[PDB]
Amino acid sequence: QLQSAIVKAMYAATIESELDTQSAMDFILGANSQEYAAAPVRLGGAKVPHLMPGDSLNLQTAQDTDNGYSVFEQSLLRYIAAGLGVSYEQLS
């Protein structure tokens, strides 16, 4: 679950464009191509890009990282504490 949350959070946006990816990131995600590692981008203020028809920037909505996993944990360590004989609140 930890790794899945990491992965789902480590993919925020997607760019789709006809033209080259370097120029696509230049014209959409700011880019610093004036200066492999693809291209880094400064984290400045809010940026609104202009895109020609056929391109799109999609913000991935991801998914809740704890969709009931906490309650499942509650039940599981309840069973564990039953097994070991110590109180559940002490163990968890």
Partner 1 sequence: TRQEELAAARAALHDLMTGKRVATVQKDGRRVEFTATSVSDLKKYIAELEVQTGMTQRRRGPAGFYV
Footprint of partner 1 (CB under 8 A): 3, 6-7, 11, 18-23, 25-31, 36-50, 52-54
What's the DSSP call for residue 59? E
Q: How far is CA 80 from the centre of its chain?
A: 32
Q: Which is nearer to a copy of itself, 35 or 61 (CB)?
A: 61
> Of 32, 73, 83, 84, which lies in the binding site for a copy of itself, with binding defined by CB under 8 A?
73
- C-alpha 41/C-alpha 57 separation (Å) is 16
Q: Does residue 29 contact residue 41 with C-beta atoms inside 8 Å?
A: yes
- With CB cut-offs between 5 and 8 Å by kind, which of a copy of itself, partner 1, none does residue 82 bind? a copy of itself
